[PDB]
Amino acid sequence: THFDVIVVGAGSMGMAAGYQLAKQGVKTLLVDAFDPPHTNGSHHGDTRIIRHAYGEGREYVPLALRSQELWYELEKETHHKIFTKTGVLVFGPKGESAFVAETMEAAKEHSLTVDLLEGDEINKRWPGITVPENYNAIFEPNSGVLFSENCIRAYRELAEARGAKVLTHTRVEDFDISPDSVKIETANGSYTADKLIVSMGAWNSKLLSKLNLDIPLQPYRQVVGFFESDESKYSNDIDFPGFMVEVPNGIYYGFPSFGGCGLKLGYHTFGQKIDPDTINREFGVYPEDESNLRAFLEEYMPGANGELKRGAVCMYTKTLDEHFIIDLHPEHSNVVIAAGFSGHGFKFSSGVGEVLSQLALTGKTEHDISIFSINRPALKE
Ligand SMILES: *Cc1cc2c(cc1C)nc1c(=O)[nH]c(=O)nc-1n2C[C@H](O)[C@H](O)[C@H](O)COP(=O)(O)OP(=O)(O)OC[C@H]1O[C@@H](n2cnc3c(N)ncnc32)[C@H](O)[C@@H]1O
Ligand SMILES: O=C(O)[C@@H]1CSCN1
Ligand SMILES: O=C(O)[C@@H]1CSCN1
Ligand SMILES: [Cl-]
């Protein structure tokens, strides 16, 4: 079969693209090194935050809101759980967080529904949080938590029912791009199509050279821990929120306990530089894994600092400016690139799937994706 479209990397972005293409009757092949969802890429550890008011930049808000609507649509189409509306709390020291400030500006610019709180008002509203009196906060009630492995599994099952094919456990090794066709090479055979979408996550850093691209991309080792917590404070059932917060030593994020799983925490602004083929995927092999998490919990969420119940090891892929790459290949209009999601892409994957399908089919998108241009100056050293 010569396909209409081949997607290389059927993860967060690729599987969403495959769903969008299959739903329009486009003959699609997706090829993945593993069998998504899996624990070797960037999409595991159960849960992902979706925010609308966006501290990385107000220009992301439209894509977040579209993505949110697409997640509700997915919820209605599958039996897997997709989204729970935890709300998202953002806080930091007053006057000392650009992230908090931009979150607040984004909410104002897009007339988002948020609550503003400070100091003891935070600790009063959410028993279990203990911030200093000089902290301030913005709480977004209508954002929340995605079950990311379920998202990918649902998109996969829906796409496959519509005739998409998923070739699993198959690494793409090389590419051959012509003006009117694309070709991939694998140990399980070679495949051709009219259009290519490249969405290989951390492996984009190693394999985009085979498309003659030289773009700084650094994979990072990013751990999360689940901790035994006071369920009377930290459970989703008592409205404990998702959160993403700035403190003097960086940004931390986390999740309420769901069904007694424990509060989940990660440290966002620090991780080890790694190669995705040699990363150590065991939690706790570095002392920082657990210690950086307990340093936050004992200070700010002291009843969520019990026994470590579970750990996970996942990867970010950062650009120099920490903005995504979503664009056509500059020399090949039949090749679409999705890369560099810099630790904050999952929430957009529904919307990005739609963009990637538009770019593959038409060479354009209705979305404004200027900030993710592959030709922008700030990508380069
Ligand atoms: C690691 C992580 C990320 C993260 C997060 C916490 C952690 C610990 N918290 C987030 C959050 O709360 N909210 C959010 O919006 N994002 C958050 N992130 C980031 C997010 O998870 C990532 O930005 C996103 O998952 C990136 O998706 P992408 O589609 O780029 O990556 P992937 O899901 O890993 O999929 C890539 C696939 O490609 C396959 N692959 C790799 N090499 C090949 C070859 N050669 N051939 C074929 N397939 C290939 C991989 O197997 C994978 O399935
Ligand atoms: O380490 C980093 O964040 C950057 C991302 S691309 C090259 N180095
Ligand atoms: O993108 C987000 O919302 C989360 C919080 S920092 C890690 N990812
Ligand atoms: Cl990432």
Author numbering: 2 to 382
From the paper:
Sarcosine oxidase from Bacillus sp. (SoxB) recognizes the cyclic imino acids l‐proline (l‐Pro), d‐proline (d‐Pro), and l‐thioproline (l‐Tpr) as minor substrates.
The reaction behavior varied depending on the substrates; notably, the absorption spectrum of l‐Tpr exhibited charge transfer, which was characteristic of substrate inhibition. Crystal structures of the enzyme–substrate complexes suggested that Tyr254 causes spatial interference with cyclic imino acids at the active site. A water network was also identified near the enzyme's active site, interacting with the side chain of Tyr254.
